[PDB]
């Protein structure tokens, strides 16, 4: 009977909420009310990079902290050196509408995807010295939003057909499918130890997944509209989310609920990208009013503004040693800040 | 040095090739095609030629008077469209195709047009509006079994504008009906009263051989308006 099942679901949800309320004895503000502020944080552009002909959708830093990749809505994928502002590679694409990029931890491969529902894996170290397409992965029933490597042989993807997948590159086939969302899936982030990951999915819900088994572990709620970005805290025990209600929030995985919210009364636009700093004290967010903001993760205050762009800001990244911060917008320029 | 010269050489070669690509990119006009299941955008695509499973997008290319056109159709996607529709904020024009022989699938078309008009990322984009299935409308109106007044009451108080330009050899009833249907869309278009983009309406059929020329002329007007606005002469 449908009604009996729905009533049982409602009862279980009430039990969940009562157990969750019973586990909150204090707030983050009260504990963190006896520390020192970080003060005004000022940054300047050190390098500016040119060459694209249309808007940019994604960037990704390398593991040596010197090279980076970038993808634009005109069918090109460029690999740059940021110490000298040179160009090391330029690759043309087959479909221009591209929405994601990734850079393998060993420096050998790159990947991309978009509105053609296909993931393309490119080789960068051929014997002849020329870039050629090494593999194409097909089987999704909607466009691809993000993709991130694990090693040179395994890769995880998320699409707007409500599902996520894990792929074996050499054979060419799927190996585990993650299903259970309701709307589209917009972002994902991998754990530092590469045994779990988190997904945000455009129905005001977030989920944590276990790679080696294929089931869900926890779900978190609290936002009021679509979730657009996600990332892990450096120790793998927290994560931050941003949405289109103009709010960021922080979630913890052991207490299983929400701790702190970042908002203001003058902010009436959405959020496009989030990222942490090396120690976990600075949280950097990108907005649709042409500039980026810098928050303090324990006091819930604002500490800085980065404001040099002309159009919507779309991508943001911090290196693996803390040195530089790179941002990219819809006017076809990247910028590097320190 | 002796290992930095090669880097500058590679950068110079890459920049040369990028210039040759920019020339070709900045001389092609990009259009987006939108419609519904009962419309005939498949037939319009098939007639615009000489003038992998689970594939997500389709492309078609044609040439009018030595100007190149690219036109994009959306294939295997879900029903919701509030995320990918933003990838089209810089096309020259949208082409909205509507069937006009239903009387009960027209309100949905009106709502979809009204939703495209008022979005934040598509307020500088112009629309070319096609109304297929004119023979069916003519037959259905002359037959007289179905009445438009059951869905739109205001048709009970409508008269053809005296300055109308009816086609020769046409019953006045068909003129009344089709002018009413056109007025609905034009009223939605001019309701905002902003003046930064325009609607261009037309009447077409299943086997007609003039659509590409219509698109040509309308795109010409769009680009002229853009140029004049660049010079502050508006």
């Amino acid at each position, epitope marked *: 009977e449908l009604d009996q099942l729905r009533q049982e679901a409602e009862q279980l949800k009430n039990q969940i909420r009562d157990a969750r309320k019973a586990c909150a004895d204090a707030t983050l503000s009260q504990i963190t009310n006896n520390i020192d502020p970080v003060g005004r944080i000022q940054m300047r552009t050190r390098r500016t990079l040119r060459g694209h002909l249309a808007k940019i959708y994604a960037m990704h830093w390398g593991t040596d902290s010197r090279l980076l990749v970038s993808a634009s809505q005109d069918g090109k994928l460029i690999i740059w050196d940021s110490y000298t502002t040179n160009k090391v590679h330029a690759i043309p694409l087959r479909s221009s509408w591209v929405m994601t990029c990734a850079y393998a931890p060993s420096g050998n491969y790159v990947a991309c995807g978009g509105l053609d529902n296909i993931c393309s894996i490119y080789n960068l170290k051929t014997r002849e010295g020329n870039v050629r397409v090494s593999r194409e992965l097909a089987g999704h029933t909607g466009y691809l939003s993000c993709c991130r490597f694990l090693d040179d042989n395994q890769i995880v993807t998320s699409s707007g057909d409500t599902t996520c997948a894990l792929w074996d590159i050499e054979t060419g086939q799927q190996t585990t499918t993650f299903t259970g969302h309701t709307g589209d899936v917009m972002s994902l982030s991998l754990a530092p130890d590469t045994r779990l990951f988190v997904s945000g999915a455009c*129905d005001a819900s977030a989920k944590l997944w276990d790679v080696r088994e294929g089931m869900c572990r926890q779900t978190f709620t609290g936002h*009021e509209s679509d979730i657009n970005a996600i990332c892990f805290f450096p120790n793998g025990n927290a994560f931050a989310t941003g949405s289109d*209600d103009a709010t960021c929030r922080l979630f913890d995985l052991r207490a299983d609920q929400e701790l702190m919210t970042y908002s203001h009364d003058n902010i009436i636009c959405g959020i496009t990208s989030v990222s942490f700093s090396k120690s976990g004290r600075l949280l950097l967010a990108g907005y649709d009013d042409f500039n980026c903001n810098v928050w303090d993760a324990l006091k819930a205050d604002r500490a800085g503004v980065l404001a040099g762009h002309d159009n919507r800001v779309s991508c943001l990244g911090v290196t693996d040693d803390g040195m530089a911060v790179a941002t990219g917008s819809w006017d076809s320029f990247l910028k590097i800040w320190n | 040095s002796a290992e930095d010269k090669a880097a500058v050489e590679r950068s110079k070669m890459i920049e040369k090739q990028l210039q040759k690509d920019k020339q070709v990119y900045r001389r092609t006009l990009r259009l987006l095609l939108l419609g519904a299941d009962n419309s005939g955008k498949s037939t319009i695509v098939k007639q615009m030629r000489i003038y992998v499973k689970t594939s997500g997008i389709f492309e078609t290319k044609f040439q009018v008077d030595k100007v190149n056109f690219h036109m994009f159709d959306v294939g295997a996607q879900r029903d*919701e469209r509030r995320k990918w529709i933003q990838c089209f904020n810089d096309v020259t024009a949208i082409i909205f195709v509507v069937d006009s022989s239903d009387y009960n699938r027209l309100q949905e078309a009106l709502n979809d047009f*009204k*939703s495209i008009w*008022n979005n*934040r990322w598509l307020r500088t984009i112009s629309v070319i509006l096609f109304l297929n299935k004119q023979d069916l409308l003519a037959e259905k109106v002359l037959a007289g079994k179905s009445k438009i007044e059951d869905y739109f*009451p205001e048709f009970a108080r409508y008269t053809t504008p005296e300055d109308a330009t009816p086609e020769p050899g046409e019953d006045p009833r068909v003129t009344r009906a089709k002018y009413f249907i056109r007025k609905e869309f034009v009223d939605i278009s001019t309701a905002s009263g902003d003046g930064r983009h325009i609607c261009y309406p037309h009447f077409t059929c299943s086997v007609d051989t003039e659509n590409a020329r219509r698109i040509f002329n309308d795109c010409k007007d769009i680009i002229l308006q853009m140029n004049l606005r660049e010079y502050n002469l508006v």
Partner: nanobody
Framework: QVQLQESGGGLVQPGGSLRLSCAAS????????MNWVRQAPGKGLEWVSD????????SYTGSVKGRFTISRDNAKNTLYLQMNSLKPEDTAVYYC?????????????????????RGQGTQVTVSS
């Protein structure tokens, strides 16, 4: 969590009148635009009426003009619809709908593909 819940419905003779109410929980009420939709046996999802944040802009469909009225209370977080002079062609299931974003004037909220911010619905039957 986002919750929309409906109340009022049932069986009415032709020529009757009735009133449908909807209660909302989990978001700021006044930053949003709201709509009514309905499902008839053997058809798709239609559109009936819509109202804006303050209440000064209202819009209807062709076949309900002169019979239905839309109302919005912000202090008590409620959406109302008043139904007069029913017909047999109104028997259906009725849902309320919220737009996906705040501070905006467009919608994309009739889809069947399990649109998230929609209620469960109430049944109205008009027969003798």
């Amino acid at each position: 969590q986002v919750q929309l819940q409906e109340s009022g419905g049932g069986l009415v003779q032709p020529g009757g009148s009735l009133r449908l109410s909807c209660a909302a929980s989990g978001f700021t009420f006044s930053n949003y635009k709201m709509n009514w939709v309905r499902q008839a046996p053997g058809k798709g999802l239609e559109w009936v009426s819509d109202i804006s944040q303050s209440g000064a802009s209202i819009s209807y469909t062709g076949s309900v003009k002169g019979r239905f009225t839309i109302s919005r209370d912000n202090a008590k977080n409620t959406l109302y619809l008043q139904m007069n002079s029913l017909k047999p062609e109104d028997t259906a299931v009725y849902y309320c709908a919220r737009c996906p974003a705040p501070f905006t004037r467009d919608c994309f909220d009739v889809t069947s593909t399990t649109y998230a911010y929609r209620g469960q619905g109430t049944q109205v039957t008009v027969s003798s």
